[PDB]
Symmetry: C5
Subunit: 337 residues, 5 copies
Amino acid sequence: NDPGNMSFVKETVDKLLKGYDIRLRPDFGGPPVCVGMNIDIASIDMVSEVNMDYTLTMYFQQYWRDKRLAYSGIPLNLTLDNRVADQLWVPDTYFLNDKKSFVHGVTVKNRMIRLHPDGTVLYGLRITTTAACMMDLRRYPLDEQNCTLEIESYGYTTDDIEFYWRGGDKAVTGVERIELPQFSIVEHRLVSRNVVFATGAYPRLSLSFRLKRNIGYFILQTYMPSILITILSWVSFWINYDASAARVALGITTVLTMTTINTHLRETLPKIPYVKAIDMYLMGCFVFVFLALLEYAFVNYIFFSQPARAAAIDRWSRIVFPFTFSLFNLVYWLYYV
Amino acid sequence: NDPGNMSFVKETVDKLLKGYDIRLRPDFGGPPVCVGMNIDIASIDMVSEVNMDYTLTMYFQQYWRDKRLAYSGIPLNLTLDNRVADQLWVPDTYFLNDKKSFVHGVTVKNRMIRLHPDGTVLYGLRITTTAACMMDLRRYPLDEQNCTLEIESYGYTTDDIEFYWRGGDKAVTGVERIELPQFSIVEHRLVSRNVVFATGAYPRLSLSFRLKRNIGYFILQTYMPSILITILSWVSFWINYDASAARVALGITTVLTMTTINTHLRETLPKIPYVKAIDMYLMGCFVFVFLALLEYAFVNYIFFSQPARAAAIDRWSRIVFPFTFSLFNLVYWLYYV
Amino acid sequence: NDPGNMSFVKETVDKLLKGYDIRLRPDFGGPPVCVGMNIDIASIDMVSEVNMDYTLTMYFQQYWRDKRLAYSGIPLNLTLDNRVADQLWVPDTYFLNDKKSFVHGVTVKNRMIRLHPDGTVLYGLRITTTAACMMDLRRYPLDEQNCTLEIESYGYTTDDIEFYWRGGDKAVTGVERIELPQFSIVEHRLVSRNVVFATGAYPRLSLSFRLKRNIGYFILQTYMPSILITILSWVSFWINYDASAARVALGITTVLTMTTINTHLRETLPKIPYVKAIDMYLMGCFVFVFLALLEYAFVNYIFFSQPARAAAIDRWSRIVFPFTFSLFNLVYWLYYV
Amino acid sequence: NDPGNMSFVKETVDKLLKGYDIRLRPDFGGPPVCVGMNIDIASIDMVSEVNMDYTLTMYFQQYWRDKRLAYSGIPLNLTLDNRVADQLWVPDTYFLNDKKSFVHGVTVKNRMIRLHPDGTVLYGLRITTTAACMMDLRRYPLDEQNCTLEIESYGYTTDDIEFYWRGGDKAVTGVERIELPQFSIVEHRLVSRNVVFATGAYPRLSLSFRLKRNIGYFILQTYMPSILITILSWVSFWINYDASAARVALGITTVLTMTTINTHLRETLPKIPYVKAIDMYLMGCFVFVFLALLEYAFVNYIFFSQPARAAAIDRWSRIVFPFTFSLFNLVYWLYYV
Amino acid sequence: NDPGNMSFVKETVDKLLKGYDIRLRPDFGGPPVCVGMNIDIASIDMVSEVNMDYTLTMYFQQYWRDKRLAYSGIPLNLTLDNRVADQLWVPDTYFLNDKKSFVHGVTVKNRMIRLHPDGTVLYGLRITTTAACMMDLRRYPLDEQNCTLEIESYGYTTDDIEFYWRGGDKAVTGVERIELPQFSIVEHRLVSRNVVFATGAYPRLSLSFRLKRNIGYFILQTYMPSILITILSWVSFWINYDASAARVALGITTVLTMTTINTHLRETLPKIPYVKAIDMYLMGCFVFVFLALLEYAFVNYIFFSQPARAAAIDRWSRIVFPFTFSLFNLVYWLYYV
Ligand SMILES: *[C@@H]1O[C@H](CO)[C@@H](O[C@@H]2O[C@H](CO)[C@@H](O[C@@H]3O[C@H](CO[C@H]4O[C@H](CO)[C@@H](O)[C@H](O)[C@@H]4O)[C@@H](O)[C@H](O[C@H]4O[C@H](CO)[C@@H](O)[C@H](O)[C@@H]4O)[C@@H]3O)[C@H](O)[C@H]2NC(C)=O)[C@H](O)[C@H]1NC(C)=O
Ligand SMILES: *[C@@H]1O[C@H](CO)[C@@H](O[C@@H]2O[C@H](CO)[C@@H](O[C@@H]3O[C@H](CO[C@H]4O[C@H](CO)[C@@H](O)[C@H](O)[C@@H]4O)[C@@H](O)[C@H](O[C@H]4O[C@H](CO)[C@@H](O)[C@H](O)[C@@H]4O)[C@@H]3O)[C@H](O)[C@H]2NC(C)=O)[C@H](O)[C@H]1NC(C)=O
Ligand SMILES: *[C@@H]1O[C@H](CO)[C@@H](O[C@@H]2O[C@H](CO)[C@@H](O[C@@H]3O[C@H](CO[C@H]4O[C@H](CO)[C@@H](O)[C@H](O)[C@@H]4O)[C@@H](O)[C@H](O[C@H]4O[C@H](CO)[C@@H](O)[C@H](O)[C@@H]4O)[C@@H]3O)[C@H](O)[C@H]2NC(C)=O)[C@H](O)[C@H]1NC(C)=O
Ligand SMILES: *[C@@H]1O[C@H](CO)[C@@H](O[C@@H]2O[C@H](CO)[C@@H](O[C@@H]3O[C@H](CO[C@H]4O[C@H](CO)[C@@H](O)[C@H](O)[C@@H]4O)[C@@H](O)[C@H](O[C@H]4O[C@H](CO)[C@@H](O)[C@H](O)[C@@H]4O)[C@@H]3O)[C@H](O)[C@H]2NC(C)=O)[C@H](O)[C@H]1NC(C)=O
Ligand SMILES: *[C@@H]1O[C@H](CO)[C@@H](O[C@@H]2O[C@H](CO)[C@@H](O[C@@H]3O[C@H](CO[C@H]4O[C@H](CO)[C@@H](O)[C@H](O)[C@@H]4O)[C@@H](O)[C@H](O[C@H]4O[C@H](CO)[C@@H](O)[C@H](O)[C@@H]4O)[C@@H]3O)[C@H](O)[C@H]2NC(C)=O)[C@H](O)[C@H]1NC(C)=O
Ligand SMILES: *[C@@H]1O[C@H](CO)[C@@H](O)[C@H](O)[C@H]1NC(C)=O
Ligand SMILES: *[C@@H]1O[C@H](CO)[C@@H](O)[C@H](O)[C@H]1NC(C)=O
Ligand SMILES: *[C@@H]1O[C@H](CO)[C@@H](O)[C@H](O)[C@H]1NC(C)=O
Ligand SMILES: *[C@@H]1O[C@H](CO)[C@@H](O)[C@H](O)[C@H]1NC(C)=O
């Protein structure tokens, strides 16, 4: 009789689950059951360009109405043990573009079932997915990626189930509390639509994040070493022309260090058949240091015929090389920013 | 009687599963049950030559008839819960060449069961399979590979089960929309045959992709550094031979850099017993960058006898080495393309 | 009645579980059930800065009261086989910041169930969890980090369940015995509070450690080589200005070694965008060595026309560079202390 | 009664499974149950020297008799659904030297149960197992390994179970089609015996392969480059003793290239304490090139005071070094071949 | 009534398991049930310092007495199917210092249940456990480590369970059959005791191994290359000092090659906050080669003012450097042996 009577609530639940067919969706053979979805993103763990995928952790909650679960006489929202979820109908909601996802199970399966007097069911899961995000790296590291999560019903068509973002544009929360060390979340968008496969029309909810890659790490790691090596190569121009060994050592060391600057990129990137921006900058710097070495080679080659022309070429280079490199940096940074 | 009446539909389903035996195939003791199949390829995640295998995610659908699951009076197709598959007969379809595969299970098992009024079952799964693919790397990285997927009945024979592609060559979809950064899909084929083993004849469906590898990554990662190091080695010919330290440093550094490139390349690949094209090109570049040092030694040797021939050798080498390298590259690229 | 009468104990347990409903929490529809918690930390396996997480193995014990499990006639505590835990109600306690956690299952599932005559339940598990600890590296490697373990009830609000540290500050034991290879644990705090989400107010526990990173390793790895390179670059001041080759070689070696040391440090950390303290020190050392090299270049550029000026500049650099570098080191080590 | 009457077949199967005790082996307490085994090796995925194990995918079929499963009236072999294997007694066959083994489960568990009218059970699995193969690498890469797969009953002794190879020497098939890029299967053997442990005598089966390593990779990666480097080191003997730069450059380049060749293979093998054949050959070649360089050093040292002696040493080296290397090759390739 | 009568044995077993409560330990409320143990070590798969743990495979067998499992009239030891282990009480044995342990499950769970007439139960499992082992790597790679395996009862105190090594000091077998490529098992010990935790005393068994590392691999891969590079610097010493390029190249190449010695070995080593012996030896060798280079540089610097002093420096260097290196090797090898 009283809500504090445990046997009465047990009888209510047993009467709810008596004759319950988990094989049928609510309102079977009639209007489709509408499911509302919310996502509370705990964190985006990693964004791997090598595998071209991002790892996400979220509280994914679905909200629908099963009239078979409506109870009368209890003025409370019955939060039931998660195991009861094995005895109810739940949507066959899956993530279209995932590769490895699971529901956490410590200390129990991270899953929540809550029933409402009007029959409404709230079903929540803590899910860690690894969704595939195809990235265009033509502007790496100054690129801007768009990674999406696609949510769909696997077996039920639009005649049987319908999806919507419960709460409108505020359905997905926690985006502003995401710390990606190498990325920043420019924007996120929610999309709802229907897609027509050969088996019929299926609902679809899309959650898209536009990430922008930072630049500080690459400045500290790649661009500054290349600029400093190029300037060190320039330093040879003020050296006296007679120092053959010194200038050749300068050229060789600069070229080899320029080659070894970014060996750490063959492991952090996939195999792509195009030039990135970092490859363009490295190629330009290598071309400049190699041209400095060739300039000294020409100076040595024509030194004997004209002792003054070698000095003239050195004096011209002292100014021509820095100005040309500055122009190259200007066009490069205006193009990619 | 109306489909809106959920109790009537539940009665019909219970009648369908009343006395149903999951251990007996449809038409047990009779004609083999035809099981059509279709595949929708979501993506080809990776293709690896170190392991000689490719990962493939797909919607795999089986279409057959089980007259024990024939219901009358309902003009609808019953999309049942994914957990009803444990209470039906499903073909023991397996992938003959796979190594490790699984069915995605978030939020629930990615599985679809649909029944039809004439007792016809559609059974769909979402499967990520890592299938082996032996590769002929004799023409790597300009190689063209052929990777297959062999679908077979495990226990039942051709006297109990038959396989065919549902819809002919249109039975496999999504092939043209596969994003492979390194490869490109030239052609895909479908074959249906029977294979004889000691236990009898088994049905067999073969799906085949011909993959053409792209060259840009290796052009910008292996060939270009080798050409640059070869030119750097050539640089020593314009250095006057009295500058001993310069030429010694150039030769030693170029030889060591070529060795490093070769070591990286051979540590990025498995241990095949034949010769790869990239190995041939690296060996040719190594031969050239060692002939440069041996030419310096030749100059230092014939310099004892006559000094004019010492300079004549350098003058001739400045023309010979670029021309010989150009001819070598010409014949190499004309053969392997 | 007899303690040795195992049949009587079985009858008592069957009476306890007769009509028991695992779907209903103790005192359902009434006051929240106070679940006290204890943790015995066996070990912290590893603290990873690259993945920003730490692995923790612990004995996690929950302690609550269920009147349905109260028994009489047995003046003893019933330590039951852990497989009875599947038939009782247990809190849906989870860890908010974990990424991959499991319960050890050899030889049996590492689990303990103990029942007390008054109805008290003790429920112990052995858990290994990879908790995500976001780290700020602006002072690395002289940084003091704060890594937390958050404990929450997934589906029950504060109306249903309440968490507390059973024993106060002594609830978590074994912290002093943790042997971290790199860090040293300074302090740990236990915080009991409540949090608010759109679904209501949830209880929260927090076990926080403050870790002070040991400095000796990075002192002997990332600082001594830099200081040695700086002093070796200083040695170039005592070299006479006639020997251009030796001073050029010293400058080249010092600058390129500083760059290689920067890369060596970079090969050990994630791709954070901000500047670390060690990065600042490496930049300072590079500035000093580059200044020394440019000073030599200046002397060489004007030594012939102004030899006394060159000698005076060399002496003043000899006396200035150690002083300025020592001042820089003192101010740097004062800034980060 | 008819084979097409599925109800009669279901009745027969249910009658067979009525009263069946999965806890008792067939003919419990009487003569041991005879289990015959066949293996159809699909492929050998990899043979790893570092891990000392090999991966093996096979169709493993067991064949025994159980009178409790004998049926009459149906003159057909009943190929039952795989799940029925969970309701029958099956031998506790396990592989003694495996590390990680599993039965494939897509789209169903790759399991086959076939019953025969006399009670004969045929039980087939598709197992992928990584079995440890401790290798002897004292003759690597000219080694010849012997890798075995051991099959044993875990619980039942020879008083309760016996093993035999069903088919004699034709029990294992598919060996002739194994495609190992690096190894070739010289021979395979079948062994049957009993092994005595403290708990009694257990049946044992052994499937042995003798793998012979292909030498083409090591010929094209180790031996040929080493021979070429040794010859190019000999080349310096024809250079004049005064040409210190060229001869010392030749020596240094040859020695460092030999070091690189040694360094190459060390990353794909375990840390075995003994000496491999490649280690011996590379040690010999390194000694040869080092002796060439040291001979030039001695010639340079004694040239100023004893020029004719230096010329004699060069001339004698021109003969001794090729002769000694020929002798070393002869003895090395007689000992290891 | 015969031992070959299967239905009689089934009646006996059903009588045994009728009225059997798996939730109660044997002698509940009475004296603790002694549980003897044995281990048959199959192998030690790997030992890792990166994770500081070892993978150990064993047959772990438990021996206890359950009066409720006593059968009469059958003079046989009933070896039951492993599935019956799910219907029996088994000790809550767990390995205290493991990280990821599992039980092999092909072709069945590697599990043995054997019942004796007097109620005795033998329960055997095959377990692959990754046990944690903290290592003192100060004397690496000449260290002797001690790795343990701690076996303990989880939920039962010393008043409910007692452990003892069944057989005495011969309770663990197969130790001498363990083949570790890099380690040799000098000794193993068995310890039995009680540990007093907050909830009273708990039984504890400990199996300890001592492993002495094999020094041969590091001799063949680390020490010999460094010694050879030092001898190469000594070779550089003997060259006539007027050959600038030769000695410069030899010194620089030796320095760089010495810097690039244990790069492969550092990868598979931790970030331990102390210096290993290999690091000290490599630092000493680098110091020696750098000192050789500096000696030559000083000789070249002062070789035009006092050639008589430069010749003396070289004569004394040729004696001091080998003697100093030999003394360093003597003291190093005496300190760590
Ligand atoms: C990463 O990249 C993806 C694309 O690859 C972006 O996704 C797109 O986002 C835009 C919104 O920014 C989507 O545009 C909207 O699509 C809705 C659904 O379209 C379907 O249904 C309608 C009928 O309802 C069909 O006409 C249509 O063909 C589709 O089948 C529309 O309902 C939206 O319409 C809105 O605007 C129009 C005016 O433009 C109004 O008239 C409408 O009333 C309504 O307000 C709109 O067109 C687009 O569909 C998305 N693409 C895909 C493939 O889904 C991500 O946004 C991007 N990431 C980020 C962070 O931006
Ligand atoms: C990657 O490599 C694989 C092989 O390793 C290729 O697979 C082969 O594909 C070809 C088609 O391109 C297959 O050839 C076809 O086989 C069919 C089946 O043959 C079975 O049945 C017949 C009887 O009907 C038996 O005689 C035979 O032994 C088999 O048991 C045939 O029906 C096809 O016949 C076609 O051609 C003939 C003329 O030659 C016509 O008369 C027919 O009407 C018909 O048009 C055909 O022969 C071949 O069997 C496949 N091999 C395997 C092992 O599967 C992949 O194609 C390749 N990848 C790519 C992208 O090409
Ligand atoms: C690592 O970083 C974390 C934060 O990310 C630190 O955790 C914080 O720890 C402090 C304590 O050091 C916490 O502050 C404490 O909060 C308690 C709870 O207050 C909440 O709940 C009550 C109701 O129960 C509300 O009334 C209140 O508004 C809050 O919503 C308080 O009870 C504590 O009070 C105690 O201290 C104050 C003085 O500070 C006294 O006046 C009180 O009498 C009492 O003794 C206290 O305020 C803080 O909430 C924690 N943060 C989070 C996010 O949980 C870790 O400490 C840090 N690691 C280390 C090693 O320091
Ligand atoms: C890789 O290396 C393993 C060893 O590490 C090899 O395995 C051995 O193979 C040989 C055969 O080449 C085996 O020898 C044979 O054993 C059979 C079983 O005998 C059992 O029973 C007797 C008692 O009846 C016991 O004494 C014995 O220990 C066994 O328990 C015998 O039946 C065989 O008999 C043959 O020789 C005798 C004479 O000696 C003749 O009278 C017979 O007619 C017959 O010709 C034989 O003795 C040996 O047991 C295997 N050992 C193991 C541990 O497996 C692999 O062969 C090798 N791999 C390859 C590819 O060669
Ligand atoms: C790797 O390192 C571990 C330690 O980290 C070593 O393990 C230790 O091994 C030694 C033996 O070499 C153990 O010493 C023995 O401890 C036993 C247990 O003592 C407890 O229990 C008894 C009652 O049973 C109490 O009285 C006692 O106070 C303790 O509470 C003792 O029973 C043993 O006694 C032996 O010697 C005495 C004389 O001194 C005799 O009278 C006894 O009969 C008996 O022979 C002994 O003292 C030590 O306990 C182990 N450590 C731990 C933590 O348990 C490993 O051995 C090492 N690896 C290798 C290969 O050596
Ligand atoms: C609780 O409900 C049951 C079932 O209706 C009833 O028998 C019992 O008396 C109730 N208890 C109280 C205290 O009202
Ligand atoms: C729905 O079908 C059931 C089962 O046949 C029947 O008992 C019930 O009366 C039907 N409902 C209506 C409204 O006819
Ligand atoms: C089929 O078998 C069932 C069960 O034995 C029997 O009742 C029925 O009459 C049979 N029908 C035919 C056509 O044989
Ligand atoms: C085996 O024992 C059962 C039970 O006592 C009995 O019914 C049966 O007849 C016995 N078997 C034989 C062959 O006597």
